[PDB]
Amino acid sequence: CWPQLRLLLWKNLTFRRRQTCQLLLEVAWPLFIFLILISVRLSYPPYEQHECHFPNKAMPSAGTLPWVQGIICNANNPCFRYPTPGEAPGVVGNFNKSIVARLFSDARRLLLYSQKDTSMKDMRKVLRTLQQIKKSSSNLKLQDFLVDNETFSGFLYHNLSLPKSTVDKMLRSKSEEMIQLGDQEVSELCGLPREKLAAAERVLRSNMDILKPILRTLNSTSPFPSKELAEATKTLLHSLGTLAQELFSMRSWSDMRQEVMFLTNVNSSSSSTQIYQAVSRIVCGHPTPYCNDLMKNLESSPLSRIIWKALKPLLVGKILYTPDTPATRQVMAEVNKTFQELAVFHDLEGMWEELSPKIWTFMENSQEMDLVRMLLDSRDNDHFWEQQLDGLDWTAQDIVAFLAKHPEDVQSSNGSVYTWREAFNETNQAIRTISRFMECVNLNKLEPIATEVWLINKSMELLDERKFWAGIVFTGITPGSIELPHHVKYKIRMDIDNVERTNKIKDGYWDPGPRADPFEDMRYVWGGFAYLQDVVEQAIIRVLTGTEKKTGVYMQQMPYPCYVDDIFLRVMSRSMPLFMTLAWIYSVAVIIKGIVYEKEARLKETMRIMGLDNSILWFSWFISSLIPLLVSAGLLVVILKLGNLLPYSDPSVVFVFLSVFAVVTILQCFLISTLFSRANLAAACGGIIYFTLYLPYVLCVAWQDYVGFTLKIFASLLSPVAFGFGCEYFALFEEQGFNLTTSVSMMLFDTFLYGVMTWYIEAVFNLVKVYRALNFYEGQITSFLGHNGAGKTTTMSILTGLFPPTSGTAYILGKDIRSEMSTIRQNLGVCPQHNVLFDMLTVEEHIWFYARLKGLSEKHVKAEMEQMALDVGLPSSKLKSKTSQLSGGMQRKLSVALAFVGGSKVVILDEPTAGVDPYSRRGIWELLLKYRQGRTIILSTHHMDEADVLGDRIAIISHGKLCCVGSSLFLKNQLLTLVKKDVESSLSSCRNSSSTVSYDAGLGSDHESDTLTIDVSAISNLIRKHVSEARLVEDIGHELTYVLPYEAAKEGAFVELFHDLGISSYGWKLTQQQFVALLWKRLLIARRSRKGFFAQIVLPAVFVCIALVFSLIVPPFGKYPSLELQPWMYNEQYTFVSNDAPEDTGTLELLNALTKDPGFGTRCMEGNPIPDTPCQAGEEEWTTAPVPQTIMDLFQNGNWTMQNPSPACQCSSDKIKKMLPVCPPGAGGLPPPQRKQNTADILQDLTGRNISDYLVKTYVQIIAKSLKNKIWVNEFRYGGFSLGVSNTQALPPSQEVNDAIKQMKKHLKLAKDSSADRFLNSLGRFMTGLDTKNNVKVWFNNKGWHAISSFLNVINNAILRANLQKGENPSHYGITAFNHPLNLTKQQLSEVALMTTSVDVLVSICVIFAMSFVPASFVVFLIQERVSKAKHLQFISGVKPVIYWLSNFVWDMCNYVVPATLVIIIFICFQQKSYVSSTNLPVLALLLLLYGWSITPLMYPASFVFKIPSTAYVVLTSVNLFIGINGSVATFVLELNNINDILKSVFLIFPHFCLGRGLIDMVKNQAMADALERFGENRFVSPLSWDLVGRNLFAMAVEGVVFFLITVLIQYRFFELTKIYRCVGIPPGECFGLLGVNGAGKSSTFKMLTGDTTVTRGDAFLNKNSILSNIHEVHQNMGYCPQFDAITELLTGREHVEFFALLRGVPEKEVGKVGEWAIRKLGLVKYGEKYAGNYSGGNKRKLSTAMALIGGPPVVFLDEPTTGMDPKARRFLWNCALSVVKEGRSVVLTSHSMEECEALCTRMAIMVNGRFRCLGSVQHLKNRFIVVRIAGSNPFGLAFPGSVLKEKHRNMLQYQLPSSLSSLARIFSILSQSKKRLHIEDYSVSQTTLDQVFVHLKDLS
Ligand SMILES: *[C@@H]1O[C@H](CO)[C@@H](O[C@@H]2O[C@H](CO)[C@@H](O[C@@H]3O[C@H](CO[C@@H]4O[C@H](CO)[C@@H](O)[C@H](O)[C@@H]4O)[C@@H](O)[C@H](O[C@@H]4O[C@H](CO)[C@@H](O)[C@H](O)[C@@H]4O)[C@@H]3O)[C@H](O)[C@H]2NC(C)=O)[C@H](O)[C@H]1NC(C)=O
Ligand SMILES: *[C@@H]1O[C@H](CO)[C@@H](O[C@@H]2O[C@H](CO)[C@@H](O)[C@H](O)[C@H]2NC(C)=O)[C@H](O)[C@H]1NC(C)=O
Ligand SMILES: *[C@@H]1O[C@H](CO)[C@@H](O)[C@H](O)[C@H]1NC(C)=O
Ligand SMILES: *[C@@H]1O[C@H](CO)[C@@H](O)[C@H](O)[C@H]1NC(C)=O
Ligand SMILES: *[C@@H]1O[C@H](CO)[C@@H](O)[C@H](O)[C@H]1NC(C)=O
Ligand SMILES: *[C@@H]1O[C@H](CO)[C@@H](O)[C@H](O)[C@H]1NC(C)=O
């Protein structure tokens, strides 16, 4: 059973080997698509991130300095990769390292020491114990003051204008030379050297004078003198000891200048990172016209963008507010306090107005500071002051301390300057810059407002004025100073570009990621919603309760674990079966074209005739379908692993799984294959049912509702969803390497169910035969000619088909057919009517395929190929031309040749001669003639003359039983004349049978020879007009004893005969009436097509409905507003509470109220948030989880794991492989810690855990747990919060700081002015703006959009439930906080108008699909009118085709009116895009109806030449879609040259006609949307729907479409019968007929001649039926008929008749029922007119000749007048023609069967090369050159009564054109032709113009 399947695969594979284009599109299409998609991979490489950890933000209840470092420091959120110590349990601050923090730390140290210092006033009492007792030690360089008892030379000596010594007579040249050096050498050591170098040049006058000054000894020996000074100066030296230690030890402004001074002094000074590198070291660690110019430069400077977006809502902006009741004014007072804790900088200029000269002179002329300069340097102060100063710290020096202390001027310029004269203008510059910068921060930013609509309007104006922070709408009650109602809302309205967009509360489609893009998506805490949240919350609390601050609240993000993003891998492998489907859309289309292609030409059924069963067919297509698909799948595997697309899953099972899906897409291709009846309708419709085979997967990716066995329920029915789900299994087990067994199971069971649908859909759409019974004998040509019984085709088709018993007939066997159901079926071939061509295999391979397919192949059929080649007759031309379509004419010779190939036991052929006349009996009767000697060959037929040429026997079934049997001689002498005897013996008159053992006057002398011949030789004389068929009554032999009767006329007396023997020899208003007649016909085909195509009305309306119902769902984009609450507000989660630093200060008080009866959130003795619905179910006692046996693993984690790390590792992301998250090996952060389910959450009390590594690891394992299951999982928790205590390691608390400002203020000129009062009080509040007694810290997750605000509301809620004194519950306090953004501006409403416009461009492309899909209906009815029926037929009758195209076009408008109106009712019954208004209706509707007016002309010149039916539907839908999407890009100009192309689109669509409705439709809805919103809140412009902007271009062009209609009809305007031209005169009485083969163009010149161009193109031009000048007379009255059956494909029979009469007669009243005198005349009114439409079979040609009958022509034409008219309608329809031309109409004729035409004709017609000039009757043409077949293959009347007296057996004589006849019986026909023959030649003048003696019965001209 192999080689029939090997050759059968030779058929299937050879079908593709002989094409070489569908194989290359086939195997090259997935190459192209998968390489393009693999390019879309290799454009986007994988994106990797380390394990991101995040800094903590700060919030202004913490302190003003930590959060302004929170703004300047970390805008970027920089992913530190290692936990920044804010993410530790205890330590929070993150900014020890900030040197700005050490500055105000030093402010606290200097103030808190100056609270406890007595130094300068003890210096004052040193001075007063020097002012009173010592009484003079005011001592400068020049002179010495001393007023005492002169303990050590108490005197004076003046370095003055002259040398004066006030102890004796000084008396000086040397005077000014002495004191000029003396004030120069006025030093501690140069007092002695001045008198020394002087005393070298002076005398012992400088010995007593120097003797007093040595006893003076420069203010150090004098300090020894009194004892009361000594203790007081000891307190001086100790006081300057500790002040020296502190004032050096502060160290900060020293290092501040020693970082800022390098950058802006050096020569190049160019920018780098180094400016904000060094500034980033200043504020953090290692890891008005000048105002406006400055803010422009700060937006200009790079690496300062995001901090400018963040600082702009701090320093410029302005905030506002609602109802101002004085209690609520306390709220605004206290938020104003939290801003004016930054306001210590306005007064700072106020110091340098006031304190500056006091300092400048105190450091110049205070004698107290002179003593500080005195004791600052001495030898006793070297040991003492450098003992305490050397032990102070690593100080500058005592000499350097002396340097920066007290000058008189500069000492030297070049050496080293580090001094206060430098420093005083250093700090003076500093306060200038800080003054002018901090004169740009409007810290008066509050504006109370009574009505919130003024707040929104003023809000809009201020927003356009560049400065707007939030606006806090309250819900305060009345102007009544009951403080707050115990439960406040508030409503922080901000604009859209800062507060997060409040439409969606989660990420949407969850991709992984940390979501920390700092500009795009951190948007609460640079735009600064949250800052309003914290400040305003702490304000409300401080009103309601009374406690002062005692909380900071930081913001830490939860860290995110080292992910990757491969969104192309993810959405690609999630959406695999689209681009897997595409290559097999092409493959499915090719294989389904194969199946129904050979179903069309009936190769399956003739293959079943060849003795096969359907198993081998369907299996063969299964295999050879499978192989190119399978190699495409293997090529996907090679492009799939090696192309870097899917690692981690082993490359074998992708090939196995694609092999399975290849199998099941094949069986779904057979399932969609067995239902179609035409080649290319299937070959384009199959891929679209492969889309709709696919789409429930895309329709099932989101809804999700089919989780359980509903996957099996929608998988047993559907194959590609079962592939998509298994590929979801690939995508889930894709990055780390329900189930796939479900996928292969539903695939395999889906295939088996598809095969049950294949068979169960297949069944739903010597050689005797004894069954009454006969015996088809040895034969050598049998025949069965019975049409009175309609089961003769069922007799042969039952004799060899799939029925051993009969079908409603005698169920019995013949020659034991069931006993040899493969043997006798393997013996006797057949040849069906449907010509088995195997359309493009090869000629010798058609012979080889039918031969080997029969059997005896490898040896015998090789030899039989040559003998088969001895039957056709073109061996090398079969080799050169092998394609069966390439041959022609003798195709039926290859049919019967293919049947008679091999060993033909009983070749039961049927109808072998339906072809060309000179090859019909020549070809088929030549092959049946020469191949006759083998065995019996039955042959049914329709034309009977070939059966008369056939030569063993005949049969005539009466009603299922043979009314005769025996050869044609036996029916001849028992009853041409046999063809007439196929009716008179077709009834039940008489039956005869002789079933014997099958085991020209010279014809008158031959007639008398037959008279003298029948006696000696027993013979029955029979001359059939050309050949003396000498029958004989002989049982055996005598073929040589009878040759003497042939010897009497042995001149070519050939025995062309057969067998016991038988010998043979050779010897107007009617215009508009036709207009409404055509419209009537269209009304008929419309109204009668119920099952007919209402799909062209249902389809556009329903796809408008799927567009609009798709449009009801989409997000509106204009609802950035909402009114949210801010609880946790998410569905299921659980938070966590870390009670860190458990030393029960106030944190115990906090957690004590965060987990008690008011609970975690916002309700208050009522369920206030609306879906929260309290539902307190959950115990009050801590209950952990059960643990598997790894707590010994935890005990041996107590070995070697402490809090430094405390899990194992994680399966970290790698360099060449990657992982989406990253897994733990064991249990990361391992024990499940304590639980407490309270209100829809179970807050897991971490306590002292390592919180960051817990969050990373346990987030990993809960995601990777619930991702294998793939519930497409959201997030597990959204925000926790540690509690805490930050240490009190700072100086003793805030009240002592304030008291230090108290007595610091009381000392040193206590003042109440504008400057020093406000500066000192503001410094007091600023310094109390840094203490954080505790601090909670919020750990939010950021993946929820609204977490950051929300837990902040939860915590500030908790502080409110904490601090209250002893109320009767903390239950009904509490605070919510509604985010609610602000109405949009011009630009934002405009931009969302643009987006909503694009979302409606979707509706443009779908309604342009539907009204793109209407006109193809009108096209395909025009193809059904152009295909050989009534374009030509109705164009024959004089119509002037302007009215024809205007008829069809006016209808197509009128039929366009209905479904477009239905679409108008669709989205006017909907409420989108068109409404009640007068700018919605007209520009829609007139555009639609006028849009049908637009398209419907332009489809007609696309429908002249489209030479294939019922596919312009498809391809015009395609090209019209490409016009639409060309529209979509043609105004996607938003993603003056742009106005040159996009405003050139109006001139581009000025001649373009189908884009205009789309894009002008989008101008319509853009205009109504834009004016809707914009006059919806603002001023008015003109509503311009019907204006010249959008719509008038559409009305201009598409109302210009009538020019395209003129292009259509103008495109069509370019497109008896006496033929005696440049002589065949067809007169008005004859019956002509075209029977010639020497010419070919007479038929094209006939349909041309019956048509417009009456003469032949490229030939003689003359007057033969001229139809040009007097048109609609000659060629238009003359009825014709095409070669096919012009049948009005589904119109009606009766209305086809009466309509065809109505369009031409102008007899409309009598043309109402002229079809009774025509349809009743044609004999087709019962079974042809009531059963209206496709009246089957032979009645169609009767209706065609009927449609040419009613014309009433002057000359008729009927070519191919019969093709299935075997029973009666050949000579009966020919009898109707005989009535036509016999009534005086002079018909024409053309036939592929010269017998039945030649019997009825009267004159032949044939053209050699010029005109026809063929004028001959049948007996004359036979007399010169049956006889009609032999001649067609090789190259007054009263004397009938005289013969009726001569021939005494006077029979009848049917008339003729010129001729007569004689039907006398052959009883004694001796003298019947003897005396009439010798008299026929004797009295041939009686037959003068007849001029013939032409030849039981006879006929004679
Ligand atoms: C909770 O659990 C987490 C688990 O991650 C702990 O996080 C650990 O925190 C440590 C903080 O000190 C991290 O150590 C850092 O490691 C960096 C990486 O350099 C390593 O170098 C060694 C040898 O040189 C190699 O073996 C490693 O493979 C790395 O190459 C160090 O650079 C870093 O040192 C710091 O650098 C900065 C910047 O230069 C300096 O400013 C600073 O002074 C210091 O020198 C530091 O040592 C550790 O990676 C991290 N993870 C793990 C798995 O240990 C938390 O600490 C736990 N919580 C508590 C409260 O302990
Ligand atoms: C901002 O938009 C809102 C809603 O679109 C407007 O709120 C309206 O308030 C008035 C007060 O009675 C009523 O018309 C409606 O309750 C609200 N909606 C509408 C559509 O009017 C608010 O007035 C707008 N403000 C501005 C300045 O446009
Ligand atoms: C600041 O530095 C001191 C070093 O004396 C250290 O003890 C303290 O813990 C640090 N504080 C913070 C919040 O980092
Ligand atoms: C300000 O200090 C600078 C330091 O370079 C000095 O040159 C200048 O003279 C000082 N100006 C006054 C007015 O003291
Ligand atoms: C608000 O604070 C500013 C300081 O920033 C101050 O000048 C102003 O007087 C305050 N106004 C009220 C009403 O407290
Ligand atoms: C709102 O603002 C418009 C101008 O923007 C102004 O004409 C109108 O009077 C304002 N209405 C109110 C209630 O403030």
Task: Quickly tell me which residue has 């890009």 as its tokens.
Answer: 1529
Residue 461 Cα: closest atom of ligand 6: 5
**What is d(CA 1836, CA 1430) in angstroms, rounded to the nearest whole number?**
47
**What is d(CA 1759, CA 1644) in angstroms, rounded to the nearest whole number?**
12
Q: Which one, of 318, 313, 291, lies nearest residue 442 by Cα?
A: 318
The answer on whether 715 is annotated among ligand-binding residues is no
Ligand nearest to the CA of 443: 5
Q: Which residues contact residue 697 at a Cβ distance below 8 angstroms, ignoring those fewer than 6 apart? A: 577, 720, 721, 724
> Which of 51, 52, 82 to mutate to test ligand 1, by most ligand atoms within 8 A of the CB atom?
82
Classify residue 1309 as exposed, middle or buried by CB count within 10 Å of its CB (0-12, 13-18, 19+): exposed
* The pair of three-digit structure tokens given for residue 324, joined into one six-digit string: 């101002």
- In a domain, residue 1642? The reply is no
Would you tell me how many other CB atoms lie within 10 Å of the CB of residue 1842?
13
The answer on whether 154 is annotated among ligand-binding residues is no
* The pair of three-digit structure tokens given for residue 890, joined into one six-digit string: 């003798």
- In a domain, residue 658? The reply is yes
> Percentage helix, strand, coil, to 5, in the chain?
45, 5, 50
Q: Which residues form ligand 5's pocket by a CB distance below 6 Å?
A: 333, 336, 339-340, 343, 443-444
- In a domain, residue 375? The reply is no
- H, E, C per residue of 1091-1143: CCCCHHHHHHHHHHHHHHHHHCCCCCCCCCCCCCCCCCCCCCCCCCEECCCCC
DSSP string over 1769-1835: HHHHHHHHHHHHHHTS-----B-S-HHHHHHH-SS-B--SSSS------HHHHHHH--HHHHHHH--
Q: Looking at the structure, do residues 1437 and 1576 belong to the same domain, yes or no?
A: yes
Q: Which one, of 113, 92, 106, 104, lies nearest residue 64 by Cα?
A: 104
Residue 1077 CA to ligand 1 center (angstroms) comes to: 96
Q: Which residues form ligand 3's pocket by a CB distance below 6 Å?
A: 91, 93, 96
- In a domain, residue 588? The reply is yes
Q: What is the domain extent for residue 1738?
A: 1680-1751
Angle between helices 274-283 and 252-260 (to 10 degrees): 170
Q: Which residues contact residue 764 at a Cβ distance below 8 angstroms, ignoring those fewer than 6 apart? A: none
Q: Looking at the structure, do residues 1438 and 1533 belong to the same domain, yes or no?
A: yes
Domain end (from 1751, 1767, 1788): 1751
Give backbone dihedrals phi and psi of 1006, rounded to 5 degrees, phi first: -75, -25
Kind of pairing between the strands at 491-493 and 1378-1379: parallel
Domain end (from 696, 730, 762): 762
Domain end (from 1611, 1634, 1649): 1611
Q: Looking at the structure, do residues 741 and 782 belong to the same domain, yes or no?
A: no
DSSP string over 189-246: SSHHHHHHHHHHHS-THHHHHHHHHHHH-TTTTTTSS-HHHHHHHHHHHHHHHHHHHH
Q: Looking at the structure, do residues 850 and 819 belong to the same domain, yes or no?
A: yes
Would you tell me how many other CB atoms lie within 10 Å of the CB of residue 207?
11
Alpha carbon nearest to ligand 4 atom 2, residue: 425
- H, E, C per residue of 743-786: HHHHHHHHHHHHHHHHHHHHCCCCEEECCCCEEECCCCCCCECC
* The pair of three-digit structure tokens given for residue 1600, joined into one six-digit string: 């210009």
Residue 456 CA to ligand 6 center (angstroms) comes to: 10
Residue 1578 CA to ligand 6 center (angstroms) comes to: 10
Q: Which residues contact residue 186 at a Cβ distance below 8 angstroms, ignoring those fewer than 6 apart? A: 141, 142, 159
Residue 339 Cα: closest atom of ligand 5: 5
Q: Looking at the structure, do residues 802 and 938 belong to the same domain, yes or no?
A: yes
Would you say 1487 and 1561 are in contact if contact means Cβ atoms under 8 Å apart? yes
Hey, which bits of 14-155 come out as E strands? 47-48
Q: Looking at the structure, do residues 773 and 744 belong to the same domain, yes or no?
A: no
Handedness of CA 809, 811, 812, 813 (dihedral sign): positive
Would you say 868 and 894 are in contact if contact means Cβ atoms under 8 Å apart? no
Angle between helices 99-114 and 64-72 (to 10 degrees): 160
**What is d(CA 1420, CA 1426) in angstroms, rounded to the nearest whole number?**
10
Residue 457 CA to ligand 6 center (angstroms) comes to: 6
Residue 421 CA to ligand 4 center (angstroms) comes to: 7
Residue 460 Cα: closest atom of ligand 2: 27
Helix (H) or strand (E) holding 42: helix 22-42
* The pair of three-digit structure tokens given for residue 15, joined into one six-digit string: 């079908």
The answer on whether 1062 is annotated among ligand-binding residues is no
**What is d(CA 1808, CA 1658) in angstroms, rounded to the nearest whole number?**
16
* β-sheet bridge partners, residue 1281: 1137, 1338
Helix (H) or strand (E) holding 889: none
* The pair of three-digit structure tokens given for residue 438, joined into one six-digit string: 């901090």
* The pair of three-digit structure tokens given for residue 1802, joined into one six-digit string: 């009267």
The answer on whether 1644 is annotated among ligand-binding residues is no
* The pair of three-digit structure tokens given for residue 1247, joined into one six-digit string: 């306590």
Q: Looking at the structure, do residues 814 and 686 belong to the same domain, yes or no?
A: no
Q: Looking at the structure, do residues 780 and 736 belong to the same domain, yes or no?
A: no
Would you say 188 and 348 are in contact if contact means Cβ atoms under 8 Å apart? no
Would you say 40 and 32 are in contact if contact means Cβ atoms under 8 Å apart? no
Q: For 600, how many CA atoms within 13 A lie in the half-sphere containing its CB? A: 16
Q: What resolution does the deposited structure have, in angstroms?
A: 4.1
**What is d(CA 617, CA 620) in angstroms, rounded to the nearest whole number?**
5
The answer on whether 787 is annotated among ligand-binding residues is yes
Task: Quickly tell me which residue has 């402490």 as its tokens.
Answer: 1202
How many domains does the chain contain in total? 4
Task: Quickly tell me which residue has 């072998």 as its tokens.
Answer: 912
Residue 1575 CA to ligand 6 center (angstroms) comes to: 14
**What is d(CA 1499, CA 1416) in angstroms, rounded to the nearest whole number?**
8
| Exposed e or buried b per residue across 1547-1574, where buried means at least 16 C-beta atoms within 10 angstroms of its C-beta | eebeeebbbbbbbbbbbbbbbbbbbebb
Q: Which residues contact residue 1694 at a Cβ distance below 8 angstroms, ignoring those fewer than 6 apart? A: 1715, 1719, 1725, 1729, 1730, 1732
Handedness of CA 735, 738, 741, 746 (dihedral sign): negative
Q: Looking at the structure, do residues 794 and 683 belong to the same domain, yes or no?
A: no
Q: Which residues contact residue 970 at a Cβ distance below 8 angstroms, ignoring those fewer than 6 apart? A: 992, 994
Q: Looking at the structure, do residues 1522 and 1546 belong to the same domain, yes or no?
A: yes
Task: Quickly tell me which residue has 């083998």 as its tokens.
Answer: 934
Q: Looking at the structure, do residues 723 and 775 belong to the same domain, yes or no?
A: no
- H, E, C per residue of 596-626: HHHHHCCHHHHHHHCCCCHHHHHHHHHHHHH
Angle between helices 1556-1577 and 1386-1410 (to 10 degrees): 150
What's the DSSP call for residue 694? Answer: H
Task: Quickly tell me which residue has 């002012």 as its tokens.
Answer: 131
- In a domain, residue 1253? The reply is no
Q: Which residues contact residue 1429 at a Cβ distance below 8 angstroms, ignoring those fewer than 6 apart? A: 1682, 1686, 1687, 1688, 1689
- In a domain, residue 1155? The reply is no
Amino acid present at 1393: A
The counts of H helices and E strands in the chain are 73, 21
Alpha carbon nearest to ligand 1 atom 46, residue: 82
Would you say 1403 and 1108 are in contact if contact means Cβ atoms under 8 Å apart? yes
- In a domain, residue 1444? The reply is yes
> Which of 324, 338, 444, 1325 to mutate to test ligand 5, by most ligand atoms within 8 A of the CB atom?
444
Alpha carbon nearest to ligand 1 atom 29, residue: 82
Technique used: cryo-EM
Residue 51 CA to ligand 1 center (angstroms) comes to: 13
DSSP string over 1598-1630: HTTTHHHHHHHHHHHHT----B----B---SS-
End-to-end CA distance of the chain: 65
Ligand 2 pocket check for 1122: Cβ under 6 Å: no
Residue 1287 Cα: closest atom of ligand 3: 13
**What is d(CA 28, CA 22) in angstroms, rounded to the nearest whole number?**
10
Task: Quickly tell me which residue has 């009609």 as its tokens.
Answer: 1828
Q: Looking at the structure, do residues 789 and 752 belong to the same domain, yes or no?
A: no
Residue 1577 Cα: closest atom of ligand 2: 28
DSSP string over 1189-1207: S-HHHHHHHHTT--SSS-S
* The pair of three-digit structure tokens given for residue 13, joined into one six-digit string: 């594979």
Angle between helices 1442-1469 and 1069-1087 (to 10 degrees): 40
- In a domain, residue 1535? The reply is yes
Q: Which one, of 909, 907, 896, lies nearest residue 847 by Cα?
A: 896
What's the DSSP call for residue 1656? Answer: P
Would you tell me how many other CB atoms lie within 10 Å of the CB of residue 677?
10
The answer on whether 786 is annotated among ligand-binding residues is yes
- H, E, C per residue of 1836-1878: CCCHHHHHHHHCCCCCCCCCCCCCCCECCCCCCCHHHHHHHHH
The answer on whether 1642 is annotated among ligand-binding residues is yes
Ligand 1 pocket check for 1210: Cβ under 6 Å: no
